[PDB]
Design a protein around this ligand. Sequence first.
Ligand SMILES: [Mg+2]
Ligand SMILES: [Mg+2]
Ligand SMILES: [Mg+2]
Ligand SMILES: [Mg+2]
Ligand SMILES: [Mg+2]
Ligand SMILES: [Mg+2]
Ligand SMILES: [Mg+2]
Ligand SMILES: [Mg+2]
Ligand SMILES: [Mg+2]
Ligand SMILES: [Mg+2]
Ligand SMILES: [Mg+2]
Ligand SMILES: [Mg+2]
Ligand SMILES: [Mg+2]
Ligand SMILES: [Mg+2]
Ligand SMILES: [Mg+2]
Ligand SMILES: [Mg+2]
Ligand SMILES: [Mg+2]
Ligand SMILES: [Mg+2]
Ligand SMILES: [Mg+2]
Ligand SMILES: [Mg+2]
Ligand SMILES: [Mg+2]
Ligand SMILES: [Mg+2]
Ligand SMILES: [Mg+2]
Ligand SMILES: [Mg+2]
Ligand SMILES: [Mg+2]
Ligand SMILES: [Mg+2]
Ligand SMILES: [Mg+2]
Ligand SMILES: [Zn+2]
Lengths: 122, 120, 86, 203, 50
Amino acid sequence: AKIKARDLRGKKKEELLKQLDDLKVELSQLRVAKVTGGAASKLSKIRVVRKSIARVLTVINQTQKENLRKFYKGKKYKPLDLRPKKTRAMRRRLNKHEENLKTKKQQRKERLYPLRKYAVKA
Amino acid sequence: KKKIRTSPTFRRPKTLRLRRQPKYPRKSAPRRNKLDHYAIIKFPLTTESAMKKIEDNNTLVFIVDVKANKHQIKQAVKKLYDIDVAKVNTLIRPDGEKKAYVRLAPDYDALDVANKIGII
Amino acid sequence: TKGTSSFGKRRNKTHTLCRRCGSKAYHLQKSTCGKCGYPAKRKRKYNWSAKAKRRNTTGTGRMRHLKIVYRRFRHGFREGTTPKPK
Amino acid sequence: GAYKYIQELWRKKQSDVMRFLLRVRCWQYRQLSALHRAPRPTRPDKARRLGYKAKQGYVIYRIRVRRGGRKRPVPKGATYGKPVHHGVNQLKFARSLQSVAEERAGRHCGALRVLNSYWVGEDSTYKFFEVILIDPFHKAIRRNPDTQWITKPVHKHREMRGLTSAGRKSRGLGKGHKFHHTIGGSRRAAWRRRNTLQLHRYR
Amino acid sequence: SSHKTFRIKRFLAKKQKQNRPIPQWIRMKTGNKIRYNSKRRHWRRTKLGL
RNA sequence: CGAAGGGACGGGCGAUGGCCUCCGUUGCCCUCGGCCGAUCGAAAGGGAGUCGGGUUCAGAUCCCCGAAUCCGGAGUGGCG
RNA sequence: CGCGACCUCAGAUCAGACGUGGCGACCCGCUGAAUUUAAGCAUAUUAGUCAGCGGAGGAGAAGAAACUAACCAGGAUUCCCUCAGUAACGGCGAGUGAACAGGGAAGAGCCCAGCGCCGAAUCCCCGCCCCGCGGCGGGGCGCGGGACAUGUGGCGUACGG
Ligand SMILES: [Mg+2]
Ligand SMILES: [Mg+2]
Ligand SMILES: [Mg+2]
Ligand SMILES: [Mg+2]
Ligand SMILES: [Mg+2]
Ligand SMILES: [Mg+2]
Ligand SMILES: [Mg+2]
Ligand SMILES: [Mg+2]
Ligand SMILES: [Mg+2]
Ligand SMILES: [Mg+2]
Ligand SMILES: [Mg+2]
Ligand SMILES: [Mg+2]
Ligand SMILES: [Mg+2]
Ligand SMILES: [Mg+2]
Ligand SMILES: [Mg+2]
Ligand SMILES: [Mg+2]
Ligand SMILES: [Mg+2]
Ligand SMILES: [Mg+2]
Ligand SMILES: [Mg+2]
Ligand SMILES: [Mg+2]
Ligand SMILES: [Mg+2]
Ligand SMILES: [Mg+2]
Ligand SMILES: [Mg+2]
Ligand SMILES: [Mg+2]
Ligand SMILES: [Mg+2]
Ligand SMILES: [Mg+2]
Ligand SMILES: [Mg+2]
Ligand SMILES: [Zn+2]
């Protein structure tokens, strides 16, 4: 009876949170038995429910995030967690488009005097 | 004239301060309420002085999170146990976490609530 | 008397735990830390103590962020990609 | 062009036309704070032959520097040991006043790049300079070659590493028989090269 | 003292949870090299910095 | 060596959302203005208002029982 | 006793950005001793070194002569070998101390302001229709704002134009 994260990614949030909050009820009932002695079969199943809550919330936080990557798909300003992360120094450098900008005087010596190709015989 | 300075002091005049209207939210989503009702109450106490207070004093006793106040505890017991609360007394133990003495209404009694929870 | 009978009058803390670097060197009346220098922005560090620099340098902690950057460096700091699903 | 007449008029600083302007401005500049943005260059020709254009992202700051020498920061004049270092008063600082005017402009404006600076009138007590600052993240500068070299991270705080026009003149670097002190790039690089003992594999 | 601040009370709470003996089942693991608690503190002999 | 008050029932011009009869708000205009110095600083100084009995292996002016009290809120009035 | 134009300043939780701090082996800018040696010691020496302060980068700094040279001349900068423990400095005591040429490692050059002509020819922003994202750009527009004649862009830099 193991829930798996790829079995969950088609089901919407009106039935993920219903499937989520009764796992949290199930986790709270197990910690009741943890302090009343309980049973060793019901103490090993704490980790099975703690990771079941972590797996449902992962699918929720990933269905939500990709729906905001696509709501802002092609907008002038995106939130700071949706624009890329890479490195602070890499976010300050010039981009692909303005590193290869050249002045009109620079791109006239490129076309009048191009670097030729030449062999020299002996 | 007809403007008149009836004070020896030049004060800075007030200007138009207008509210923000940003082109984008700085955070994409509001952050999830990670201290919810199931994160308030962690586990009850079943000690020999806790069962002695369920009988004579008509009150439950839980181990709550250290971040919670007496209003969140009174609402979390009211939600996920379907019982009404008179008052809540709290202390932080030398273990580190916070003990909550939640007292029920005189309608209910904690002896047939602890049967449903299963701590008895 | 300067010996034993004057140690009994010691009941007043001079230093306490600091918010930055956590050592018990935050002076209460001077409002400063004797270890990291905190009321201030810049961290206290001196070159006349080589041993005291290898006790709070980068690496002696967790490096919660730099151990990920050292991993993400090996793939060109790639971002927004999914490892070719089945 | 009318920039050739302004260039010759500022070479007449003792003329009765030009000593009047250099006193009414020095009065005006004395009544303001030591860090003060000018809305435009006071010398529009001297600024532009040092790299100023009338575009967006080039700003001007007016810096007020106390003139005089460098009194040694020692308590009650007692510099201990060996009377050659007993000098307290008649000491001179290694960088010029224009080099410490550029440095106070760029330390307050950390998000800007110090390009260069010029002179706008002294005092007996003060000395006034105007510094040319560049905003390295405006799109009027980063979308332009021949000026986007300063938008590179190697040019951050170039007034503090001593690589502006006034900060470099106090380094002693140049071509010649006079500048043998800095004949490896700097005075420290030349010192480190002629004080390493080269120990080869085969002696 | 009975008058204490919350972040020193939380300091004292940590250093009595780790004033604890070693578990009985630690000493049967593969590659043990640990037999007691080498950093265990008594309130009378060795005091706390705080 | 500072243009250091972003506040004020009221007055009112009203854009006007409505139990639009109004009536809680709202922005600006006219009107009035120094806690004149951010802030920190006392578990012995200043500082509203809790006491009696009972109760535990260890807690109580804090928990029970019984008597009070202070502060704040009451627009839809809670009645005299 | 208003309405405007500008100029000089100011306020804002205004729209969008940017700087701070760490590390610091190397690099740059300052600041800067004394022990030591001189068989004492003060100039000198240690040493422009230690400690102190600031700023970086994957290198940095330097760099296309206001140069070396006096030759039948060389031709940016950095590094190595040599010059050379030399020229020189020094209570001419102790001590200190380069550079040129030559041989190599690499090898690369260029851009302004000014002076001038060219109906500002130039740039920034915000909407817009069309194509991509994955460091967000081009193409067109808008009798749409703004910067700008207190000088933007093109040609052009001492090797001449
Ligand atoms: Mg050109
Ligand atoms: Mg309490
Ligand atoms: Mg810090
Ligand atoms: Mg001085
Ligand atoms: Mg000496
Ligand atoms: Mg110096
Ligand atoms: Mg003792
Ligand atoms: Mg100790
Ligand atoms: Mg006032
Ligand atoms: Mg106080
Ligand atoms: Mg008090
Ligand atoms: Mg008191
Ligand atoms: Mg007692
Ligand atoms: Mg804003
Ligand atoms: Mg001696
Ligand atoms: Mg001797
Ligand atoms: Mg002696
Ligand atoms: Mg010296
Ligand atoms: Mg040092
Ligand atoms: Mg820094
Ligand atoms: Mg870096
Ligand atoms: Mg290099
Ligand atoms: Mg460089
Ligand atoms: Mg030249
Ligand atoms: Mg020889
Ligand atoms: Mg020397
Ligand atoms: Mg021109
Ligand atoms: Zn500290």
